[PDB]
Amino acid sequence: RYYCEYCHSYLTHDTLSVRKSHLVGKNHLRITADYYRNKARDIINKHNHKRRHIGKRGRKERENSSQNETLKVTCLSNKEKRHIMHVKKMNQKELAQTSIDTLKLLYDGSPGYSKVFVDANRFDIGDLVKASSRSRDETCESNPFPRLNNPKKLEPPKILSQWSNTIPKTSIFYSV
Amino acid sequence: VGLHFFSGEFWDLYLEQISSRCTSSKKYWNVLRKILEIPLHSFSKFYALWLQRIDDIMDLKQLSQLTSKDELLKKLKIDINYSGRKGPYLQDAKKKLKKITKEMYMVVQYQVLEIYSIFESKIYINYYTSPETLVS
Amino acid sequence: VSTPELKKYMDKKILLNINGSRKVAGILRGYDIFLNVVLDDAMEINGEDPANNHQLGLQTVIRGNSIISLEALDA
Amino acid sequence: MKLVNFLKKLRNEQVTIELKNGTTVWGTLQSVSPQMNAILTDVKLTLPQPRLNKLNSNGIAMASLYLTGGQQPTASDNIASLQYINIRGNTIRQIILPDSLNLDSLLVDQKQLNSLRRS
Amino acid sequence: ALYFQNLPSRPANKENYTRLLLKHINPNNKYAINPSLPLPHNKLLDDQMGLLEVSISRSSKMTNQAFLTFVTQEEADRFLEKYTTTALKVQGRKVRMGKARTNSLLGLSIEMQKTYNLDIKKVLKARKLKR
Amino acid sequence: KIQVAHSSRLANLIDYKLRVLTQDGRVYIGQLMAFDKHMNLVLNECIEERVPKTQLDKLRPRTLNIKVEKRVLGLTILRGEQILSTVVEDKPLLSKKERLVRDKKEKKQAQKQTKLRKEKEKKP
Amino acid sequence: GIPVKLLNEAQGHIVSLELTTGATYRGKLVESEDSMNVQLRDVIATEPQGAVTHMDQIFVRGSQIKFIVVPDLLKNAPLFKKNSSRPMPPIR
Amino acid sequence: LSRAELEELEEFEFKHGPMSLINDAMVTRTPVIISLRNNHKIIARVKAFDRHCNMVLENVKELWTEKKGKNVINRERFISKLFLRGDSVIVVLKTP
RNA sequence: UAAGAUAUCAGAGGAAAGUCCUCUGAUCAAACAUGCGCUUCCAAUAGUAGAAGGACGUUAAGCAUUUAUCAUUGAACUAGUUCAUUGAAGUCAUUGAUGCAAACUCCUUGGUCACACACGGCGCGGAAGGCGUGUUUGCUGACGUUCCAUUCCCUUGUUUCAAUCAUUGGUUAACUGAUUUUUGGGGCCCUUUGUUUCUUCUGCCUGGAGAAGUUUGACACCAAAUAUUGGUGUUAGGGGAGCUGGGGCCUUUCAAAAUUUUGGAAGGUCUUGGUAGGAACGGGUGGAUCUUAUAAUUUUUGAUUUAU
Secondary structure (H helix, E strand, O other): OOEEOOOOEEOOOOOHHHHHHHHOOHHHHHHHHHHHHHHHHHHHHOOOOOOOOOOOOOHHHHHHOOOOOOOOOOOOOHHHHHHHHHHHHHHHHHHHOOOOOHHHHHOOOOOOHHHHOOOOOOOOOHHHHOOOOOOOOOOOOOOOOOOOOOOOOOOOOOOOOOOOOOOOOOOOOOOO | OOOOOOOHHHHHHHHHHHHHHOOOOOHHHHHHHHHOOOOOOOOHHHHHHHHHHHHHOOOHHHHOOOOOHHHHHHHOOOOOOOOOOOHHHHHHHHHHHHHHHHHHHHHHHHHHHHHHHHHHOOOOOOOOOOOOOOOO | OOOOOOOOOOOOEEEEEEOOOEEEEEEEEEEOOOOOEEEEEEEEEOOOOOOOOEEOOOEEEEOOOOEEEEEEOOO | OOOHHHHOOOOOOEEEEEEOOOOEEEEEEEOOOOOOOOEEEEEEEEOOOOOOOOOOOOHHHHHHHHHOOOOOOOOOOOEEEEEEEEEOHHHEEEEEOOOOOOHHHHOOOHHHHHHHOOO | OEEEOOOOOOOOOHHHHHHHHHHHHOOOOOOOOOOOOOOOOOOOOOOOOOEEEEEOOOOOOOOOOEEEEEOOHHHHHHHHHHHOOOOOEEOOEEOOEEOOOOOOOOHHHHHOOOOHHHHHHHHHHHHHHHO | OOOOOOOOOOOOOOOOEEEEEEOOOEEEOOEEEEOOOOOOOEEOOEEEEEOOOOHHHHHOOOOOOOOOEEEEEOOEEEOOOOEEEEEEOOOOOOOHHHHHHHHHHHHHHHHHHHHHHHHHHHOO | OHHHHHHHHOOOOEEEOOEOOOOEEEEEEEEEOOOOOEEEEEEEEEOOOOOEEEEEEEEEOHHHEOEEEOOHHHHHOOOOOOOOOOOOOOOO | OOHHHHHHHHHHHHHOOOOHHHHHHHHOOOOEEEEEOOOOEEEEEEEEEOOOOOEEEEEEEEEEEEEOOOOEEEEEEEEEEEEEOOOOEEEEEEOO
């Protein structure tokens, strides 16, 4: 007999094709997509709880650290730490999905932009994406002069929220 | 082409290839110390990565990979050989170390927001086109 | 046991390496469970492209104990 | 008949498996598999010296001898001692079994007698 | 004839422990190769430049300490003045060492060559130390 | 070094960092995870180690040091045809007692899933 | 056997090869059958004397494969669970 | 076929077939010469054989010769009892 | 891909030959216990160390070497060499590759345990084997069906001393030992890094706290499309009572043999393990192994000792 252990279910009618109908079935794909999403975070979320080995401290260092004053520690509340871990987890999700693609935005009206950045129609990748519009025929006859009320200004540089109040308050020149 | 104002996405390749490939994790701190001093368009994506490391530093030995044993004790006055009850001491070291990042984020941000607001905002065309193209 | 699925390959020009050094390009007709393969208009490739290259025969069948790789040089 | 079923009864004996390479393996034998996967214990795997005024020995086997991690640095001649070596069957050329054991007790296969006694 | 203090206790086998004791004393010595070890009988040298035999008990009284005998008394001191009270360290710990109050046990075999009553004496007192 | 169990077959020593030899004189050293009828095996974090042709004159009979050129390749599936022998290198990260503990908690947790699945399939 | 069942778990991910001739292919793995023979798509092929090329589609007799290197996140796919609890099968 | 049918077939091919040369050499206590694909030959007496052509031998005398730039030597190695894997052999003759 | 099988041997018994089945021996194996003066290993603090393994790290363009296409046509040329043109293929590299060696830096691992600073064992562990007895079992695991099953308490910085309080025992109200409550003093740890990392909720470094809960359940987390459904994981550690298994020892009772040995029953003492599932039975049940199809190109019945 045969079964798929992501779904945990046995196949009802065993043939080769019923397997392939289950192997590329919508239900089964959503399981195996979700199964590896759980094993991804679990290696990171279950952080290596290391084992400590405490040495018997010296007579010398015990006197040199006694004269040194005891520093204050900061412990947050349970309600506080449940929110701050909700934030810091959601922040690391953002740094995954940045993908800084300003450079594609800069060469928009150039003479080979269809052939290099559209990426349905390169050579290296182009045959593979057609399986799984802005065509390759585009030349520099259409849109001769870019600035004819068409172009958008460059989106300004991003900044950190936490340190949003380090910015100089006034601009040097008067913008419109 | 490292100081190119739009080089942001070049370094993101280079940092992808250190983490992925190399084992030690002393080059990844060494390179990222450079990107912090350059006025790139997207610099805040590189301070976010520095601040995600500093927080995840969990032992005092891991502050040696940032900067030398001496320059820690002189410029900030924190010691790695401090044997004691470390928890608050490393919680202090971070707060003292995170500060001089923030003063560097004050330095670069002035240089970026100058260059963006004066020059780079206005320049609408960064490519060649042809000998028949005319610029504004 | 199972037949190798080269169903998408057939009738395209195909280079393949016989044992070690010899390379044989032709148009793939048929195949079997052992990967013994038969192809039309064969030509033995070498270092000098027109010079040392010579044609083999109208139909030739290769034993699957000497196929290493079989690249499909067409769509 | 399978004569590999003879080897299974030869268990806890000193033996020399001698491989296709030319590498001899002197050791204490354990469970031989049906495909002749012999698995030894207190072993000493070596290469002989084909003398003939420095004829070069097996180049591949010298590499595989050092790689095992058993060759000690001050081994002057080419030997390597270790515990536990599992050996894939097809590589066995010979097996030099010891002088003491009697073949006549062991070469009587049980499934040979159990076919004739049953008929 | 010499007597050490605070040596590492833990390597429990004698042939293995004296390997470490020979290793820290003389790097690139005879025994950093590991085929075989010499064993002189009660009544040959281990390493060059003075060394002959080492001796270590497991008893609770002679715990971290270990006797050590040389070829002669001047060479035994010549080893102590090789370092000249600059404390060298085996595995991890700095050794403090002095001259042995009791004479070297195999040195007496060398001295009287230059001894059954001593062997009679050992049996008698150890029976009384048993009491 | 490490003393392996005197009667321990290839099924027993899962998680033991092995030292597998192929026919060409190249060795793959890693944690074993599966095996098979015809003895092809899945190592976890293996490293191929090769003695280069230049170093090989040094192993001919006369402390020797050999420059072994190695390359990392994590999680392989070897082939049987190629294996020549195996030898054991390290022992697993978890104890013998602790590998029984993790079995019984997982044997308990696996059974709990089925009964929670069967009663979620029965009524709905 | 798990060694082969793993290779089916790696469809549509980048893998490597090493054919017993001493080549090294590394491209996305499209098909595999039970005899460990594979079809790779969009590959980079390294000849035994170092020469590298690119070929769109390749088939290899499984008999000549020396090893396959798989993505490292399948190290904890459920082939490797020791104690598994399958439900009672449906009646045919 | 059945399991009993193959037992008849195996007894035939050992008795009335090509391997009858080995089987008639085991019974009659006649020494054989064997050539392995090693290119060295063993002069021995057979004590058992099998399907795969592997065989247990007794009073083995191997005779192996090697050459390196047209310089020959003939080495002789004696063994009491040996077990020979069957793929190695290419030709078995039966001595007169 | 299929079929078959689930240790072997020997004896007695049931339906002259063999098969089927059953209890009695031997041998073999697994699991579990449990022993051996069994074997090996388990890191400074009386100090700023060190052992094993790395670095796909640096010094470093180190030092020492050797390498950068072939064919066709003309000119000059010695009697090979350079220049220009035409064709063929062409991993990148020359800060390379190959050989030699050192120094430094940094990473992962552990009993950084207890007692002692004392002229060739028999401290309490943990890790890894070898060897020996005993019991169970004879491939192993879910699932169903009838049955046997059937507990608690304290603690989650730790240790030590002092103060008092309470309880129990010894002896002539007093003394002593054990245990518990409130305070104070001292020692060590707090990286527990989400400040105890069994959950949830409250909460903290001038403190180690408080509330609720514990498996047909609860909690955490991930995924969506417009609350729901589908997935992964957590539910712990320490001590004591009980209850029960195994081990050694002692005394008693009994049977055999010539005061002793061997076996069985009970009580006492030391030590060690378990403490919520277990038995029978049942299936067109799962997986392991074994034999044969299978020595005929895709693994194991030879094309890697470079050989004439």
